[PDB]
């Protein structure tokens, strides 16, 4: 019983019109509110990680042993909640990108001499680099690490880092469950999935970039670890024959391609070493024919 058409409020022309009216101040406020809602989702995810802390720690070191991997999985609780909440984060971040991209195009047209200086200054330390990024994101420039997300997620240092690491594990091992969902079907009309799981590419990347900046870890390494475990878990269902569990197997495989395309920390070469492109190629063929 929706009373509005979402496309008439969220497309390129509309987001550009919004940016004209709100400007950098307004769009920055809009984002801060978007980030607040991600903070709340993140806080809830950490709760689910702590609830599964034992199983998740073992899964992280038992990645090479499949018999106990499938056995540990059955001991996990609230997997559906983890996926649902990461999708919501991804959905909110997808909206922010639309907003930011529109703001960027409006400013480049209104204040080109300032935008020029900002683009140069961004393209050429770890605490000082955040000040460059906040000024950049204010002009709608895409940043590798999202400053507003870093701020919102900053609200025991060794304990926090573990939970972050184990969240990645939680998500990676959960991805194959999406293949049982009829709504996980990839659609060429969408260039994504009916249940928004394509937005997970953005959630996984940006959440990892933010959390492992706050905990001064290595984003590249943690995502590499994530991809290895994600690929491994998804390859396992490739031999499966059950019509329920494998219904949208090929559409879920496509997430790995999206994750790597979205992430500046991940390369196609690295993807090739753990998930051969011929599987993704065949998957794309299946959904497009």
């Amino acid at each position: 019983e929706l009373t509005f058409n979402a496309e008439e409020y969220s497309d390129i022309s509309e987001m550009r019109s919004l940016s004209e009216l709100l400007g950098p101040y307004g769009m920055k406020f809009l984002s801060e509110s978007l980030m607040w809602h991600i903070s709340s989702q993140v806080a809830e995810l950490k709760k689910l990680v702590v609830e599964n802390v034992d199983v998740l720690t073992q899964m992280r070191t038992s990645f090479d042993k499949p018999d106990q991997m499938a056995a540990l999985f059955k001991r996990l609780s609230s997997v559906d909640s983890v996926l649902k909440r990461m999708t919501i984060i991804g959905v909110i971040l997808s909206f922010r990108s639309l907003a930011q991209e529109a703001l960027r195009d409006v400013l480049s047209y209104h204040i080109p001499f300032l935008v020029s200086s900002i683009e140069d200054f961004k393209d050429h330390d770890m605490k000082v680099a955040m000040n460059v990024y906040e000024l950049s994101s204010a002009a709608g420039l895409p940043c590798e690490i999202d400053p507003a997300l870093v701020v919102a997620l900053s609200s025991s240092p060794e304990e926090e880092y573990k939970i972050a690491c184990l969240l990645m594990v939680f998500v990676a091992v959960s991805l194959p469950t999406l293949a049982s969902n009829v709504m996980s079907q990839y659609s060429p009309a969408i260039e994504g999935h009916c249940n928004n799981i394509h937005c997970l590419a953005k959630a996984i990347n940006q959440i990892a970039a933010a959390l492992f900046t706050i905990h001064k870890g290595s984003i590249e390494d943690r995502l590499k670890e994530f991809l290895a475990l994600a690929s491994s878990s998804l390859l396992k269902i490739g031999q499966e024959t059950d019509k329920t569990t494998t219904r949208n197997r090929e559409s879920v495989y496509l997430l790995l391609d999206m994750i790597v395309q979205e992430s500046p920390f991940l390369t196609m070469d690295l993807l090739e070493s753990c998930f051969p492109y011929v599987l993704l190629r065949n998957a794309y063929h299946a959904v497009y024919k």
Binding site: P112, F113, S116, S117, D120, D123, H124
Partner: protein, 106 residues
């Protein structure tokens, strides 16, 4: 540095390539010798031991010369990449300066 690139382009890569073509001609004679020496000698056991020795030596040499030349090529490409990175930065500043000037006239 421009000097590092000059060394690689004019001396080290041509030198490494020369060592590789030499390896091609030398190992052809080494192979000939090992084959003929065995056929020509009554002391077959000693001849084989000599072939074995030349094989190991050859494998070690080829691997080394390739490793050295590859490392030099990678260094050359890394330098050329950073050259373009600095040049883009320099061109961009000129472009901004021209933009500013054209606006001032306007």
């Amino acid at each position: 540095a421009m000097a590092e690139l000059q060394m690689l382009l004019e001396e080290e890569i041509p030198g490494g390539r020369r060592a590789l073509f030499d390896s091609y001609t030398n190992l052809e004679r080494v192979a000939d010798y090992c084959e003929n020496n065995y056929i020509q000698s009554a002391d077959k056991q000693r001849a084989l031991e000599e072939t074995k020795a030349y094989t190991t030596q050859s494998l070690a040499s080829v691997a080394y010369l390739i490793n050295t030349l590859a490392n030099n090529v990678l260094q050359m490409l890394d330098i050329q990449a950073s050259q373009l990175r600095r040049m883009e930065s320099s061109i961009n500043h000129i472009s901004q300066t021209v933009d500013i000037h054209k606006e001032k006239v306007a």
